[PDB]
Amino acid sequence: HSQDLENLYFQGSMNIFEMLRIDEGLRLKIYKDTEGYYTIGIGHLLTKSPSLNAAKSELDKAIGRNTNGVITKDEAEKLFNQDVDAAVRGILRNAKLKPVYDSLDAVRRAALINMVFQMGETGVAGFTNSLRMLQQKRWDEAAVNLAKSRWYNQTPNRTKRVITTFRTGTWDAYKNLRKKLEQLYNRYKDPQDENKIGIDGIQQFCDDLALDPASISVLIIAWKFRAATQCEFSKQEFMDGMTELGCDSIEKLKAQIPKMEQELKEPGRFKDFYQFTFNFAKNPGQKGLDLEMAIAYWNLVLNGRFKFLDLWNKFLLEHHSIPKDTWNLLLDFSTMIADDMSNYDEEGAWPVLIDDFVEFARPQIAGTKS
Numbered sequence: 033h034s035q036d037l038e039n040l041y042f043q044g045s046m047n048i049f050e051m052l053r054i055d056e057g058l059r060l061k062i063y064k065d066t067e068g069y070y071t072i073g074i075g076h077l078l079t080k081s082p083s084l085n086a087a088k089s090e091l092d093k094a095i096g097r098n099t100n101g102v103i104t105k106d107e108a109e110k111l112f113n114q115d116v117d118a119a120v121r122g123i124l125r126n127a128k129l130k131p132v133y134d135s136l137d138a139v140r141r142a143a144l145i146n147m148v149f150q151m152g153e154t155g156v157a158g159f160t161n162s163l164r165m166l167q168q169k170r171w172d173e174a175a176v177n178l179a180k181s182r183w184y185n186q187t188p189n190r191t192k193r194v195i196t197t198f199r200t201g202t203w204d205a206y207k208n209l210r211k212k213l214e215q216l217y218n219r220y221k222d223p224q225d226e227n228k229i230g231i232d233g234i235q236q237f238c239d240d241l242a243l244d245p246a247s248i249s250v251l252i253i254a255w256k257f258r259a260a261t262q263c264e265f266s267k268q269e270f271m272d273g274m275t276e277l278g279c280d281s282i283e284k285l286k287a288q289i290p291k292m293e294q295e296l297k298e299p300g301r302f303k304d305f306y307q308f309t310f311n312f313a314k315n316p317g318q319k320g321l322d323l324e325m326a327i328a329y330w331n332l333v334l335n336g337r338f339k340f341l342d343l344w345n346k347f348l349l350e351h352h353s354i355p356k357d358t359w360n361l362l363l364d365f366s367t368m369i370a371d372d373m374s375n376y377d378e379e380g381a382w383p384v385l386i387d388d389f390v391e392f393a394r395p396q397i398a399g400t401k402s
């Protein structure tokens with residue numbers, strides 16, 4: 033098959049795909065990008081359709097099998113390589129980019145393609161003076177000039193690596209990044225399971241970030257790392273998260289935490305975080321969340337947000353598992369409910385648990401009015 037990666041085995045193992053895996057990151061399951069559009073792989077837009085089945089249909093045509101929204105890294109590379117071919121075709125019919133592209137060695141061409149993936153042809157073509165420097169092989173001067181750009185300010189760590197690639201014509205920046213992340217991961221990894229960071233590594237991670245392990249900030253990090261389950265941090269999660277956060281160091285991750293916290297001031301992002309917490313907290317082997325665990329995470333994530341949290345605890349501690357829908361709807365309840373619960377709609381198909389809670393809160397609500 034034309035797309036078989038075996039056709040690239042004559043190349044180096046470092047390539048544009050591995051470069052963008054580092055710089056942009058790789059998603060092997062369909063997800064919604066920034067504009068809400070179904071995407072997979074390295075930034076491969078599947079469709080602007082709101083229909084996930086439409087996205088899966090586009091993915092199956094592109095991959096050539098029934099994927100059900102999940103692909104392998106190799107399949108993602110094949111998708112990416114098609115996108116690279118298209119980007120190269122575009123470069124080559126761009127009067128402003130073709131001269132420099134033709135002039136560049138293969139590694140520096142990858143750096144230019146990286147730029148085109150990030151900012152598009154018109155964006156890259158705006159770098160007239162730096163592109164001339166590159167075309168003249170004035171590498172250090174190009175590097176200096178590119179670093180003065182807004183590009184650098186937007187994505188300093190990626191941009192630094194791309195610039196280094198222009199400067200050196202080598203993959204050093206990517207080798208160095210990979211090694212940095214490997215060596216940081218190795219600081220935290222479970223001595224008995226190379227594939228995860230365990231409790232002790234998470235403790236060390238928190239210590240290195242000067243975070244109380246029981247703080248919401250730690251759960252916020254897990255959320256940004258799309259961690260699957262509490263008390264584990266898989267190698268994939270760690271690497272993917274550091275990539276997506278643009279961090280290759282603990283200092284950089286530390287500087288990112290307030291930005292993740294700031295993201296939560298958006299109710300839509302807080303809802304995402306809130307819903308994330310359910311699957312994260314739940315035992316993988318279980319379909320629902322143990323009430324005791326639910327209470328613990330509710331108190332972490334809803335304290336200060338859910339005005340009846342204290343009554344909710346009292347209610348639940350008198351109760352003798354929580355399904356995802358009930359977890360989710362508690363936030364909806366929290367958002368709509370009047371300070372005295374007078375606007376509860378019993379016919380709103382709330383969980384029975386919430387119906388019962390509204391009934392339970394009656395003595396307290398009556399006492400307060402008294």
Ligand SMILES: Cc1ccc([C@H]2c3c(C)nn(-c4ccccc4)c3NC(=O)[C@H]2NC(=O)c2cccc(C)c2)cc1
Binds near residue numbers: 245247254257263
């Ligand atoms: C040292 C350490 C701190 C926190 C935890 C969990 C945990 C546990 C076991 N109770 N727990 C909690 C529950 C309610 C209130 C307060 C804390 C939490 N709060 C979460 O962030 C938990 N976070 C993770 O596992 C986890 C996974 C992947 C990446 C990252 C960065 C974290 C375990 C170990």
